Every structure is written in C-alpha cells, then in structure tokens.
Design goal:
Chain B: This is E3 ubiquitin-protein ligase UBR5. The structure is cut from a larger assembly and holds two copies of chain A. Chain A has 255 residues and is an alpha+beta fold. The first copy, chain A, has four helices and 14 strands. In chain A, the strands form three sheets. A seven-stranded mixed beta sheet of chain A has the order 7-6-5-8-9-10-11. In chain A, strands 1-2-3-4 form a four-stranded antiparallel beta sheet. The longest helix of chain A has 17 residues. The first copy, chain A, starts with 14 loop residues before the first helix and ends in a 12-residue tail after the last helix.
C-alpha cells in the first residue's frame, strides 16, 4: 500500500528549500504517523501509473485502467499539509467500459487516451467528457482536425499550454489549450510522421507548457517554444537585415 | 512498516514484527514478506542496518556530558537496542552477512558508517556481530577472513577510508576548546565551501 502526500514550493525558489519540504514530509511520517485524509484513502490500495495536477483539480491514472479527479486548493494559512482537497472525488464516467493507458492535463481541460488509442476531452467545468453522437470513437472535438480519429494514439504528454501525442504509426500531433485555440494555427500541427523522427520509434513524450521533446529509441528530438535568449538573437538578426541597404515610382508597394 | 518502526525507534514494534517473521520462517509462510523487508531501502541506498546506524548518530555534546515523539535519551537507547536486536534475531541471521557487506551510497558498510558518524557504540555492536557471522560461515568455500574484511573494510576500499585510520582522524573542531579565541594553529582555505582566503578552517576540519 502507498500514501499520497502533497508538496508545494513557491516559484522561483531554491533546491534546498525544496529538500526541506520533502524533509517535513519525512518528519511527519516518523513523528506523527497521522491517518491519511478520507478523500484519497480509496487510492491507498490502488496502483497509480501516472498523476497530473490541473489548475483546480488533481487527476490520477491507475494501472487497472481507471481514471479520477478531485478539486484542490493551496491554503494561504500554511504557505505563510499546504493543500486541502474536497470530499467529492469524481471517477471517470466510463460508460464504454474502456481502459485508459495514459493521461495529461491542460489549463481548461483534462486529457486521457484509451487502450484503443482514442483521445478524450473533459473540461474541468463539465460533469462528463465530450462525446460525438455521430462518431462513437471521437471523444475529442478536434481529433478530426489532427487526424487522430483514424490513428491509434499510444503515448500522450500535456502540460497547461501544449498537448502532444504519438500514434502507433509514429505520427506526432500537437494541439494547444482552448485559450490559444484562436492563435493555434501557428502552434498546432496535425498527425504527421516527421522525417526527422522516421526510422526510430517514440518511447515516451515530454511535453511542457512551451514545447515537447520525444524520446526515441536511439536519439532525442524536440519541438515547441524557444527560450527568450534565442528569441532575442533571432529578432536582432531580422532587424539588422531589414535596416541594411530607393527607386520609388507610382504603383510601387512600400512599407 | 518495519523500516518505519526502525526509524521511529519503536523497539517493541520491531520486536513484535521480528517474532512474526520468525514464525513466518518456521511455518514456511509469508516468506516473500521477509525477503521484501530485507530488500527495503531508504535514501542513500541504506538498508535496515544502515538506517539503525544513522539513527544512532549523536547530535550534541551536551547529551554525552549528561551520560558521563521519542525523546533523545530513549531515541539513542532504542536505536542501539534495535540494531542489536536485528543483529541477534534468528530472522536475519542468514541475511546479516549480505546486509553488513552491503555498501551505501558512499561505499560504506554499516560498521564504517557507525565509525564515520561517531556512533562508536553502534560500531562496536556491529563489529562483534560481524565476527560472529564470519565464524558461523567457516563451512563455506571462502576463507573466514574474506567475509570478515568485507563486513568491516571491504576489498577495493580506499585505505584512507579505513575504519581504524578514520577513527584516529575523527577529532573535534578546535572551536570546541578554543571558542572564538585566536590560537596559533594550522589553518586551511577551502574554495569548495566558500572558505576563501579571508576565512579558514583548522586542520581537523580540513581532514573530516
């Protein structure tokens, strides 16, 4: 059996501060021996494969294929357990009887992939996941755009801003939180097997708010947002090129 | 559970668990439970005996002066009793060889750690236990004196880490008897710890 402990660390911070948070957990285990809070005591005898945290709810994936979520809040009274959970835990409305293989989370919605490779969307404000009445295997409204309605997803990774998947056919697809869905035309790409990735299988995905890296059998490959320093080097090069050296006549197009 | 009893210094709980594990051995039941417990580790690749040793470490000279949640008095007493209990228990006798020859994240056996942490009582308990073990397995294809040296100071060990040498090296900081007064003593700089030229440490600190 296992126990679930919550750790919070102000950001930015330091390594040793974090080590002290962990130290406090250890101290409680060997000093208080306190009983675990009811809301997650059902998970003590369960086996957890993956766990993610959303902006208002935590979510867990079990090795038995089940998925669940619970609302949480960080208490300012202990920032000065630092986390308090609601008493209502929500198990995935599994009306299909289909097990899940991996999970992820975005700011507006929870994400999950079934053993059939189907992509599921479930917004935090919704009591049930999305379902297409005209397509029983389409549990994500934008799967058609990504082409994931005909591809078996085998791996997923998603953190807040960005979400990326690998299909069994090695096709990568990437979509972004609905809050960027309106500018996603420069953020997203449909399911494609990039030539840079062909020849190796994707073992796992490492998505983050800004970019994704795919861990392949004998190499590493990444895509997504550039850190600030290179964004600056790029902009500077562009500006310099524009300033470096006019026959302007009627009809000429100018800026 | 039992690792926590060790770390909590719950001598009674440890003893009860060992009695149940002894029954498990005798009855040929829950044998996987015993093997699982033996395989338990905490951070630093420390096994149950390493955990005992680490708990036995002192925290202040005031406690030793007096000698000359669990309270410090009971903490030390129970940690020592648990170490000795595990060493004497019939449950672990077949496995104490491996547990005592096992090396932690710093390459030290439980005995070497007891010396390094100044837990000399624990080091003595472990040394007595180790001789018992090597003298129990004289029936093996190994020489008594391979098993013994492993438990105490295993082959390939950096001689500078040898328990005898270390025991001699483990003196106290000069501050413990100089205070903040200035005396004529050798002093060292250590950039690794930010002890730049304006700062310094005494020879003993430089060594340990």
């Amino acid at each position: 059996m296992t126990s679930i402990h919550f750790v919070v660390h102000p950001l930015p911070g330091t390594e040793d501060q974090l080590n002290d948070r962990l130290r406090e957990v250890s101290e409680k285990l060997n000093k208080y021996n306190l009983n675990s809070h009811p809301p997650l005591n059902v998970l003590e005898q369960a086996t957890i494969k993956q766990c993610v945290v959303g902006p208002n709810h935590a979510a867990f994936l079990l090795e038995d294929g089940r998925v669940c979520r619970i609302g949480f809040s960080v208490q300012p009274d202990r920032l000065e357990s630092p986390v308090s959970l609601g008493e209502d835990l929500q198990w995935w409305p599994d009306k299909d009887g289909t097990k899940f293989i991996c999970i992820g989370a975005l700011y507006s919605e929870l994400l999950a992939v079934s053993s059939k490779g189907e992509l599921y969307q479930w917004k935090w404000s919704e009591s049930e996941p999305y379902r297409n009445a005209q397509n029983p295997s389409l549990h994500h409204p934008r799967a058609t755009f990504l082409g994931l309605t005909n591809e078996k997803i085998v791996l997923l990774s998603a953190n807040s801003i960005r979400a990326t998947v690998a299909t069994e056919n090695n096709k990568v697809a990437t979509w972004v939180d609905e809050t960027l869905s309106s500018v996603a035309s420069k953020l997203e790409h449909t399911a494609q097997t990039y030539s840079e990735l062909q020849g190796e299988r994707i073992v796992s995905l490492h998505c983050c708010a800004l970019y994704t890296c795919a861990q392949l059998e004998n190499s590493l490959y990444w895509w997504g947002v550039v850190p600030f320093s290179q964004r600056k080097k790029m902009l500077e090069k562009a500006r310099a090129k524009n300033k470096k050296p006019p026959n302007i006549t009627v009809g000429t197009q100018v800026c | 559970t039992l690792m926590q009893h060790i770390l909590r210094c719950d001598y009674e709980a440890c003893r009860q668990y060992l009695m149940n594990l002894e029954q498990a051995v005798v009855l040929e039941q829950n044998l996987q439970m015993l093997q699982t417990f033996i395989s338990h580790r905490c951070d630093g690749n420390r096994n149950i005996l390493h955990a005992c040793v680490s708990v036995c470490f002192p925290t202040s000279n005031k406690e030793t002066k007096e000698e000359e949640v669990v309270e410090s008095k009971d903490r030390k007493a129970n940690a020592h009793f648990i170490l000795k209990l595990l060493c004497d228990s019939v449950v672990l006798q077949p496995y104490l060889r491996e547990l005592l020859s096992a090396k932690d994240a710093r390459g030290m056996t439980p005995f070497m750690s007891a010396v390094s942490g100044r837990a000399y009582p624990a080091a003595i308990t472990i040394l007595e236990t180790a001789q018992k073990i090597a003298k129990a397995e004289i029936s093996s294809s190994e020489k008594e004196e391979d098993v013994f040296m492993g438990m105490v100071c295993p082959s390939g060990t950096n001689p500078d880490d040898s328990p005898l040498y270390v025991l001699c090296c483990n003196d106290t900081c000069s501050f413990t008897w100089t205070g903040a007064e200035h005396i004529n003593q050798d002093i060292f700089e250590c950039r690794t710890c930010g002890l730049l030229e304006s700062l310094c440490c005494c020879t003993e600190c430089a060594r340990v």
